[PDB]
Symmetry: C3
Subunit: 332 residues, 3 copies
């Protein structure tokens, strides 16, 4: 009887940060209550000032990471305020039935709904909007995020021993398809209905104009670089709701990687790069061994360095000359 | 001595259905006899009426699924009737030697041939036509299918326990490259020789115009939706002879997935989405837990919903409100 | 104390050949000394005579395969002669810290540097140039190779039993983005600075003009086909520094495949085709069972047969009619 279970309300945080949770479950199964408010908003996505009409869960691209344990119930109140213009819904890849919830969550502006589902499978999973007939438009306008369903006893390595992260980050990677005129400049539009056919045309090229982390070129750099210290264990959850990606930590590795995100499987060890298929979340665990700047990229390096799919870590601590050193510095 | 082995003749069926077979082998090794007749034919591939000249095994895109057991011999009579115009052959990825059989099976119109090979490795595998100098044209004109080589003791899970499917379906996914003029409309052609250079040009864009299941937009929908019942165990074999895909069951999972199709490996568990590389067949096993409509898609959602890579399941049975429920239906 | 370790100097060879080494380490950990000299040079990459300005390690595309054992130190002297025009560096995906070495190895023309790193993880790994702000241009101009870090006790199968190769080859796969004018012909350029914006434009299409093995269409064919004999065990290391590939041996298999290249993981068995993500090296082990010609391809068959990603093996020995035979040769 679900009404006999504890309820716990989660207050979500903006990516790449993750709401507080416990890796090993400290209670029995719970109904974990989340609320998200859909926001259609203008977003500047590149250094040139390109502005799109984004479609967001909770004001961010990606939407926030939700965290529960296996066999918890996820109860989401989804709000579509009347200041939005479009119908929206939500599909959880973690859920079973009704198109992941999408068939049960269609909300016009001015409406809300509450969905509950049992998180029966452990892993990281995509969630995304999926309105019938408009699915890729919403997804590729930023309307996607992820949920992590932890095993009740936390993560385990390939031998069944615990893996405990000290920090966790959520990198959502977004492919945008900003319509281009025949000279190659972006078009912007006066209403969503006026934009729809050229959005479809742009999407049908299968060639993103932008591929970004955390909603914009450079979002995970500078004052918003990811951080760690030498010796810290970091889990990086990475999602891509629509298109393949190949994450890579420049100067590091994925020590343990669930490339397709499902924790009942043993992780892949010692990865340089891994393939997260479109429509999937993956997770990589790494223990930092060197300080300095790292780049975290999609290792299609055109996608990374020309289209935007690159962020930074700033890592503090002691340099290990045994692992790496300049024997003779660059010189004539 | 192969002549001392039983022979069994298989009568193939049209995808997505699969000819009758036994998961666990009920006999010793056999020579399993198949016949396929090549058919070049016009096919309408989309709702707009776009018509291509398809190149088929047995009249369908994809060609039919062949099913044998490990260490059976596959003996294929391949017929190229004189009503066709082109040379064709067949390459089995399941086979060893002679370019998978392609070097031994070149048939002009009016010819036939019989190839035998030993199915030494268990898995699902692509087969496709591959005429020297014309390989991607034939493949991307629909001339590909798959073969399943079951272990003699049937499928097993990651722990070595049996997995027994109640139903099996074969989804062949086809990328087409219909030539476009500079305004973007399709060109159609008066002979295959007149079409060849612009087919090559279209292919070299690496951008399909259409990506379809079972040969056309919407083929696996409506009266031709896939079906199941709650509690049934379903294996979905999925092939892509030329280009990566990322299957996903909307509202479900791959409970056990051989993403690259080879049954000696343990399956991946609990997948949301999986990557089947171009040139591969994969297989996913799922036990349905909820009734209703599901979409089965390539989770590049542009490829699915704009280019055609989407089908449906219609599932009968009882709804489980513990797994999912609408707590508060959409309302103001 | 690293100065107490043996030093061994390796003399590299041109791909697809691999410098001599021992699978099982015959000594304790060593400092393995390599020297590479950067060469910017014109290269003809296709049958039409298309000429690019390649950026190479040691004069080849790909750069040579380096081979060490786990817990050896790699000490690379990297030389940028004053006959080159650009700044270069090197990033080893095998290494930890300083962007894989790139932050420590920036050499102007007329400079050299020596980097040392500890090869702490076994596998095959990409290395590539990565000058800040110019990364994909250098990589997609050919400035990438691979390093193999063998386990000290050599390779093992999924059950922990030895796998010993008789031959090894290194196939580097290169995506080139030769700029095209609006009629589709290649542009060539008078200086690298004059080429840079249109290189970026070409790259941003995400559509290679050429995808080649060993630096050119047809490089691994004819007198330069790969060779083997029936019964020989062959390891094929395959890298792609920038873009996904899907290798396939036509007429064979990957008997044991590390698709993402990391030897602590059990290999995948019996693969037809496997996905090597951009930014990764993979390795496939096969024992030849039939003589004749094989094609080794990227199984996007457009990429293989139209864009260049195809090579050949020529295999000597006895034909096995039990594995495959023509029962009835093509005839009316
Ligand atoms: O609790 N069974 O999903
Ligand atoms: O933080 N416990 O390993
Ligand atoms: O928004 N960070 O640069
Ligand atoms: O190419 N990735 O969907
Ligand atoms: O080494 N990362 O491009
Ligand atoms: O989902 N396996 O990483
Ligand atoms: O029966 N040996 O392939
Ligand atoms: O249908 N036997 O599990
Ligand atoms: O052909 N089924 O819609
Ligand atoms: O992008 N798949 O071949
Ligand atoms: O949840 N499938 O788009
Ligand atoms: O082929 N392994 O799924
Ligand atoms: O030797 N420790 O990397
Ligand atoms: O060559 N030893 O298996
Ligand atoms: O360079 N071999 O054809
Ligand atoms: O599509 N591969 O980067
Ligand atoms: O069978 N290889 O195209
Ligand atoms: O890296 N595992 O092949
Ligand atoms: Cu929406
Ligand atoms: Cu989805
Ligand atoms: Cu054909
Ligand atoms: Cu093939
Ligand atoms: Cu360089
Ligand atoms: Cu790199």
């Amino acid at each position: 009887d679900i009404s006999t279970l504890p309820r716990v309300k989660v207050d979500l945080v903006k990516p790449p940060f993750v709401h507080a949770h416990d890796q090993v479950a400290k209670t029995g199964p719970r109904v974990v209550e989340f609320t998200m408010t859909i926001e259609e908003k203008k977003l500047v996505i590149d250094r040139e000032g390109t502005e799109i009409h984004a479609m967001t869960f909770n004001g961010s691209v990606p939407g926030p990471l939700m965290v529960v344990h296996e066999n918890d119930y996820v109860e989401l109140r989804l709000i579509n305020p009347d200041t939005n213009t479009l119908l929206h819904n939500i599909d959880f890849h973690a859920a079973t039935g009704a198109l992941g919830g999408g068939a049960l969550t269609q909300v016009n502006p001015g409406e809300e709904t509450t969905l509950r589902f049992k998180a029966t499978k452990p892993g990281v999973f995509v969630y995304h909007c999926a309105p019938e007939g408009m699915v890729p438009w919403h997804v590729t306008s930023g309307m996607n995020g992820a949920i992590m369903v932890l095993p009740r006893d936390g993560l385990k390595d390939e031998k069944g021993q615990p893996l405990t992260y000290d920090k966790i980050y959520y990198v959502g990677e977004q492919d945008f398809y900003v319509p281009k005129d025949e000279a190659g400049n972006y078009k912007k539009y006066e209403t969503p209905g006026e934009a729809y056919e050229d959005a479809v045309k742009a999407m049908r090229t299968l060639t993103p104009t932008h591929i970004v982390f955390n909603g914009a070129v450079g979002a995970l750099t500078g004052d918003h670089a990811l951080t760690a210290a030498v010796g810290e264990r970091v889990l990086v959850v990475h999602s891509q709701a629509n298109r393949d990606t190949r994450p890579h930590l420049i100067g590091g590795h994925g020590d343990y990687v669930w490339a397709t995100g499902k924790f009942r499987n043993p992780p892949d060890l010692d990865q340089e790069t891994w393939l997260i298929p479109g429509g999937t979340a993956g997770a990589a665990f790494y223990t930092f061994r060197q300080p300095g700047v790292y780049a975290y990229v999609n290792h299609n390096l055109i996608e990374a360095f020309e289209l935007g799919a690159a962020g930074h870590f700033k890592v503090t601590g002691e340099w290990n000359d045994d692992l790496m050193t300049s024997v003779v510095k660059p010189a004539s």
